[PDB]
């Protein structure tokens, strides 16, 4: 692979970036995560939190608490769901793309296959097993066989696929973060129907995921104007140093910011700065290395907010509700708080991390801020 070597100047740059942006660093990283796609602020924030991840607590008796966040995106077509998957595949290390259907007869999980030329049985590993301690960008989640769903249940819950058929009793590690996207079965998403109805799947699978974003295609004139303007700006771009009319051949020092080009970045009175990809990768690695520890204030705030959230879910719920508020929301909030503490480079979680986690969770469930 490619070793991400660091120098003293790189560490100085990272420290300067942390100091100058002691606040709203999360906002800058979320905005700079994918510039081509317009909008989708909270989806980008959740993707960044997934990239950073959480912490795994192994208790004395041996029970293990998973520290990976899972995100699922259901909505209308032509809303750039797959583009986010491609950006995640291009940014995060150890990302394995799948088509949802599976890798030949192996499927998403592992399975035993015979050669049919000599009859010997070999254990071929699926995509989920291969991307251990990584990110799996499953696309078209609905196009999945029943056996794959049943196996995915256990794989996402325990994190250890167990195979004992054909006399081969073995257990493989599949601790992976799962980012999945899907399209409606009825062509257009019906808001009134429940997400399991629209996607055409079970409900426990929806319970496995931590966050559930519903991205609807809006036909407001202003939104269409802005999106069309951005698309045309991106499609008129010429890389510097190219003679006008040139065609691509198709052959067969760390920078904090990128050079400002009015076509791509947009002339927002030169008030917008976008961090380069290399800096993002190095910062994400350094953030991954750290392991924060929770404090009492965060625990109290999270407990009270969870109580209020569940009380608010008990009342109202007249309109379509994405998901019920079970006890898994507490685990999700803790993981998001740890992720934000990692991104801020602090080693102790405080109240602000819990506040950001609460905003994300409330937007994911109630679909409205606060």
């Amino acid at each position: 692979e490619i070793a991400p070597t660091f120098s003293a100047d790189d560490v100085a740059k990272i420290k300067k970036f942390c100091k100058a942006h002691s606040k709203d660093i999360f906002e800058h990283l979320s905005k700079s995560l994918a510039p081509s796609i317009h909008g989708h602020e909270y989806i980008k924030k959740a993707i960044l939190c997934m990239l950073l991840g959480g912490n795994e607590k192994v208790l004395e008796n041996g029970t293990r608490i998973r520290g990976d966040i899972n995100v699922l995106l259901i909505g209308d077509p032509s809303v750039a769901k797959s583009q986010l998957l491609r950006y995640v595949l291009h940014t995060a290390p150890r990302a394995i793309p799948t088509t949802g259907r599976g890798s030949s007869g192996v499927g998403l999980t592992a399975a035993v296959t015979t050669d049919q030329e000599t009859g010997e049985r070999r254990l071929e590993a699926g995509a989920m097993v291969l991307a251990d301690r990584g990110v799996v960008c499953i696309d078209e989640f609905d196009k999945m066989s029943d056996m794959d769903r049943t196996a995915i249940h256990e794989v996402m819950e325990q994190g250890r696929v167990t195979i004992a058929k054909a006399g081969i009793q073995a257990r493989l590690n599949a601790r992976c973060s799962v980012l999945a996207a899907a399209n409606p079965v009825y062509g257009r998403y019906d808001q009134y129907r429940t997400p399991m109805e629209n996607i055409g799947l079970q409900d426990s699978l929806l319970s496995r995921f931590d966050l559930l974003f519903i991205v609807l295609d809006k036909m407001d004139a202003d939104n269409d104007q802005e999106i069309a303007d951005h698309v045309l700006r991106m499609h008129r771009y010429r890389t510097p140093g190219e003679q006008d009319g040139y065609a691509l051949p198709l052959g067969c020092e760390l920078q904090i910011y990128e050079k400002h080009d009015n076509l791509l970045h947009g002339p927002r009175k030169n008030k917008s700065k976008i961090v380069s990809m290399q800096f993002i990768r190095k910062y994400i690695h350094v953030a991954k290395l750290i392991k924060p520890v929770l404090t009492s204030e965060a625990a109290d705030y999270i407990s009270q907010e969870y109580a209020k959230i569940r009380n608010h879910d008990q009342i109202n719920n007249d309109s379509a509700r994405t998901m019920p508020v079970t006890a898994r929301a507490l685990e999700t909030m803790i993981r998001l708080s740890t992720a934000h503490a990692k991104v801020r480079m602090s080693k102790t979680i405080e109240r602000q991390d819990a506040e950001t986690a609460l905003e994300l969770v409330q937007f994911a469930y109630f679909k409205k801020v606060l």
Partner: peptide, 17 residues
């Protein structure tokens, strides 16, 4: 610079040049 990495207990597991 590398001291700050040691401050957070990260220098031990960072690929130095």
């Amino acid at each position: 610079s590398f001291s700050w990495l040691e401050e957070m207990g990260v220098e031990d597991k960072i690929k130095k040049p």
